[PDB]
Write a protein that binds this DNA or RNA. Structure first.
Lengths: 229, 129, 106, 329, 30, 51, 25, 213
RNA sequence: AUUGUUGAUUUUGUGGGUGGUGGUGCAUGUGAUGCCCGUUCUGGCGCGCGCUACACUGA
């Protein structure tokens, strides 16, 4: 009985940004990301490519893997939820640098070119499109709490925490709100990087999960919960 | 008329919704009246354009492509009628001969013994020399 | 029941000089989009064509678009004023020689 | 001639055989025009034999055959502009039949089929079909197009238009069909016809030149049989099947009422009823489009990120000026 | 192989391997 | 879009409301009550808005 | 009549997917 | 228990990464990459677009690290574009970095087996059907195919039967690589899906369907 | 015919089989072995000041 919309042409949903706080959205914060640049040309320090320089720097090379952050971004951006324009990704570098990842970005799939992109971003503070029509990656002011939606539920991925069904958790949760997931891209460490911001801690599976699989597993649950398909 | 959203099936729809959708399909009847002389009382708005659906299977390729537009989003603001109004059978044949793209002729692998039927394999049953 | 506007409907898009111009934009700044046509030039052309500048590009009638094209294609015929329409390497080598001399001094 | 001029024997035989393929086709059409009722058995032995030879040639010289085939279509069209049906002859029916043999009919676009299919559809509509000879010409044409679309099963609107008038033409109006435009009301079949005798439904080509009630009945049966096949294959699949068959259903109903003994319309009518029962005529929904994803852009960056000459000249002047000034001090 | 090519040609595959949609450019305009 | 302006002050747009995607042909202020505004659209729903 | 309205209507007339990588150079 | 090709009775989620572009080239034999070796592949004449083992690498990470694999209910097969079939032991933990993965593949392709001191990665004789379970459902990931819910698809499937998915690790190509083996092809979402995401999504249905958790 | 004088070695037209001074392992060199699939030159900034913008409180 309801009259049809005047225009039925499928239109891309709006690109979510930090400025808009009202829309229900999924935030995924890739905390403890190990991204740091150093002159040899500046190269994103890698656990395998460079061990001596990190030893000379004195930081343990175990926590010197930008690959994990690369893999998490690949699965997060390629998930259908991002295609529906309901997911914006943040990265908190271990040093303390916060990076806003525009959902429109198409990061290079190979790791070598990804490193070339990061060194550009960390020094130039922004990455512009090839056709130059918006900033894809931009550094922003800490703390992350300001940039998150005004009404938002905060959680972080903990193995010790109780196991939950992600689809059920999102369903019981309110609607005007938004869900923020703190994922630890660190290879190994104490799950307290986001204790100051987060209000409670949850577990997704009984077995240990990688950063990449854990975020993708959480995204698919939101996709079913909101019927993103 | 091109599409009724109520009859679309969604994967997330619950089994009860599936059952309700099935009953709606079984009960449907076309309400368009062809003999009514008042255009406002023909109930065409409640009917649908099945006739345009058939035309995408038209033998001519280009005519089929035009009919496919109703299956595509309505991006174009309008179509210039003067570019389509006065076409004739002669125009189609002449336009067909003066085709921008020239293709290779193909051949049929199947073989027919006799072109016309008698009074093995016959290409035109029911026609005889 | 039968009402037909002689002036015609609002045109959302228009084609002038092989260029697509949006109807929603004002005539002067819609014609600015055409290459070689600026704000001042478009304003002068609209003034010559006797088109009311408050109109949107859609509101324009056919005769006025013909007139605008004629203004633009034949400006002189319509009295549009005309005003409207290795050594450095040697210097670098000399500077290099100056620096080499100055290093020789020290 | 083919043996005497094979490609290997001498240079240029490919071109000569290529042209001979075109010449051979005109001969096959030419013979059909000539009267052959005297020696139908002899003509049958020569016509099919020549066609078999043409098929072997077409395998190697389809290009020369393709050019000649298109030329015939244009020539025949030109003759139709002036003489109308008088231009059409038995060979023209034969020619369309040969194209089906030597080319792939079930293609969306083709050099020879598409002009031919368009040209045949023009005859099915433009021609008056006001005489038994002309209707018999149409009955053959309907069979040709049906075999052209034997696999593709595309929808030909003229086939619908042809069936409506011809079926009505033999019942002349009953005053219930004013939407169908007839061209001859004097071909109405008499009532005393039996429709129970076993009459051949095959239309011989040679009879058309000669072209009473028995011939009229035989033509009607052949057209009616072709209608039955079309309903089963093409129209059954189409979404608008009920709309296409509704006028024909009324016409067939008149046949049963007027001739109770006649069985073909009842079998078709029972068949048509069966199809309409199973098919679910649901509102078509074609505008359900897949959602469009958010745009994607590739980032812009330098592969080896680094932290005209007049500027470099200016740049080095600064260093030298500073580096001179200290010396003066 | 032959039947597969026939199916492709049936669905709009045109051997110059173009498509029927390509032939429908400028046909109606002129 | 239904646009509400101050009379004799064209520049400022006191209130803008998107009644529907279809055209809004009729927009009238309710005579006794100043706050409520009525809008009619080709959507065939005559929505009653309040400023 | 076609020519007259033909003239008037002249004025009237007017993505990475899946695993695709960004272009090389 | 660690599932193996010999055992056919157990229900399992099989994944076949068809059109895997793993190739060794010697100027020493090194895994071909779209970026590192562009001139070398040009000399070989193969298009550099379809010279990406990273796609096969990423899919292995998510597949092997998925919870279903940890529960011993998944086994992976890789069909190289060259025509080489590889069995991936569920217990393997392939190197995370791509470079260390490339060095493993050249070892596997030449030595035909990787052993710890059961072969973790072993090349096997085609066709895959012999290796696949006797009672097994076969499907491919097709964008054009109708969209389904993986949870609904697995639950309606029989219990003794297993499900085999053919994921196209190729960057771009026609989805007929597994047409001859497969019986019916399904779409997983309206939007186009990457190989890594699609296998991850299909897995996620598996744990929820079978309650692996 | 053709070669570079020479004498049927070639040349032309139409068809047309061939992966092969190919690798790599296996079995006491052999195997209708498994597996896949060149030549010669010519070039090669760090630390600091000041000012203007990123609009409607505006052009």
């Amino acid at each position: 009985q309801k009259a049809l919309p005047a225009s039925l042409v499928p239109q891309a949903p709006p690109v979510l940004t930090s400025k808009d706080k009202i829309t229900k959205r999924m935030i995924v914060v890739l905390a403890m990301a190990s991204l740091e640049t150093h002159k040899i040309k500046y190269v994103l320090l890698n656990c395998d490519d460079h061990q001596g320089l990190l030893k000379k720097m004195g930081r343990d090379i175990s926590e010197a893997r930008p690959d994990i952050t690369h893999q998490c971004l690949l699965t997060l951006l390629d998930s259908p939820i991002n295609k529906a324009g309901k997911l914006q990704v943040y990265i908190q570098t271990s040093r303390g640098i916060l990076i806003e990842v525009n959902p429109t970005v198409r990061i290079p799939r190979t790791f070598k070119r990804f490193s070339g992109l990061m060194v550009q971003l960390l020094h130039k503070l922004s990455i512009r499109s090839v056709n130059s029509e918006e900033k894809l990656l931009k550094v922003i002011k800490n703390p992350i709490t300001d940039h998150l939606p005004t009404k938002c539920r905060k959680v972080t991925l903990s193995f010790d925490a109780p196991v939950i069904r992600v689809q059920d958790y999102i369903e019981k949760l309110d609607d005007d709100e938004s869900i923020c997931v703190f994922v630890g891209a660190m290879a190994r460490g104490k799950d307290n990087f986001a204790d100051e911001y987060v209000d409670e801690k949850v577990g997704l599976s009984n077995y240990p999960l990688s950063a990449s699989v854990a975020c993708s597993k959480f995204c698919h649950g939101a996709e079913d919960a909101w019927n993103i398909l | 008329m091109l599409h009724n959203p109520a009859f679309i099936s969604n994967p997330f729809q619950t089994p009860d919704q599936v059952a309700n959708l099935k009953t709606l399909k079984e009960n449907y009847v076309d309400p368009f009246d062809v003999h009514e002389s008042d255009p406002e009382l023909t109930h065409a708005l409640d009917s649908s354009l099945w006739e345009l659906a058939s035309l995408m299977e038209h033998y001519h390729p280009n005519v089929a492509t035009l009919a496919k537009i109703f299956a595509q989003p309505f991006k174009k603001l309008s179509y210039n009628m003067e570019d389509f109004l006065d076409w004739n059978y002669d125009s189609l044949l002449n336009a067909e001969s003066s085709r921008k793209l020239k293709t290779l002729p193909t051949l049929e692998f199947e073989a027919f013994t006799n072109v016309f039927d008698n009074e093995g394999n016959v290409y035109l049953p029911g026609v005889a020399w | 029941s039968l009402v037909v506007q002689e002036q015609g409907s609002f045109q959302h898009i228009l084609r002038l000089l092989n260029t697509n111009v949006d109807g929603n934009i004002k005539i002067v700044y819609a014609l600015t989009t055409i290459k070689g046509v600026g704000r001042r030039y478009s304003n002068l052309v609209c003034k010559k064509a006797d088109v009311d500048l408050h109109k949107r590009a859609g509101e324009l009638t056919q005769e006025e678009l013909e007139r605008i094209v004629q203004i633009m294609q034949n400006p002189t015929h319509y009295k549009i004023p005309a005003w409207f329409l290795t050594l450095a390497n040697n210097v670098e080598s000399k500077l290099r020689d100056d620096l080499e001399r100055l290093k020789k001094i020290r | 001639i083919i043996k005497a001029y094979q490609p290997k024997l001498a240079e240029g035989n490919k071109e000569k055989l290529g042209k001979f393929t075109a010449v051979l086709l005109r001969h096959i059409i030419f013979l059909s025009n000539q009267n052959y009722l005297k020696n139908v058995q002899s003509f049958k032995r020569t016509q099919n034999a020549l066609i078999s030879i043409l098929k072997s040639l077409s395998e190697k010289y389809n290009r020369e055959l393709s050019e000649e085939c298109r030329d015939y279509i244009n020539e025949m069209q030109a003759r139709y502009k002036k003489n109308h049906f008088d231009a059409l002859s038995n060979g023209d029916l034969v020619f369309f039949s040969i194209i089906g043999i030597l080319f792939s009919t079930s293609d969306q676009y083709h050099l020879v089929i598409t002009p031919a299919l368009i040209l045949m559809s023009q005859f099915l509509e433009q021609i008056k079909f006001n005489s038994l000879k002309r209707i018999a010409f149409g009955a053959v044409l309907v069979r040709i197009v049906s075999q052209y679309q034997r696999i593709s099963k595309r929808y030909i609107p003229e086939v619908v238009y042809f069936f409506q008038k011809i079926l009505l033409t033999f019942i002349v109006k009953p005053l219930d069909f004013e939407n169908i435009r007839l061209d001859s009301y004097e071909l109405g079949l008499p009532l005393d016809v039996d429709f129970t005798k076993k009459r051949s439904t095959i239309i011989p080509l040679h009879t058309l030149s000669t072209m009473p009630v028995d011939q009229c009945v035989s033509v009607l049966l052949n057209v009616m049989e072709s209608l039955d096949a079309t309903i089963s294959t093409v129209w059954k699949s189409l979404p608008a099947f009920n709309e296409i068959i509704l006028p024909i259903q009324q016409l067939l109903s008149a046949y049963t009422s007027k001739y109770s003994d006649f069985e073909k319309p009842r079998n078709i009518l029972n068949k048509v009823e069966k199809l309409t029962k199973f098919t679910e005529h649901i509102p078509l929904a074609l505008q359900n489009h897949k959602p469009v994803s958010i745009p994607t852009h590739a980032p812009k960056y330098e592969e080896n990120f680094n932290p005209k000459m007049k500027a470099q000249l200016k740049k080095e002047r600064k260093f030298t000026m500073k580096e001179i000034r200290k010396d003066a001090k | 192989e032959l039947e597969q090519q026939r199916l492709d040609r049936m669905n709009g595959m045109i051997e110059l391997e173009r498509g029927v949609e390509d032939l429908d450019d400028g046909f109606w305009e002129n | 879009l239904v646009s509400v302006y101050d009379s004799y002050n064209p520049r400022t747009i006191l209130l803008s409301i998107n009644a529907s995607t279809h055209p809004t042909h009729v927009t009238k202020f309710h005579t006794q009550d100043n706050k409520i505004l009525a809008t009619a659209s080709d959507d065939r729903v005559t929505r009653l808005w309040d400023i | 009549d076609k020519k007259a309205r033909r003239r008037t209507l002249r004025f009237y007339t007017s993505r990475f997917k899946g695993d695709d990588d960004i272009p090389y150079k």
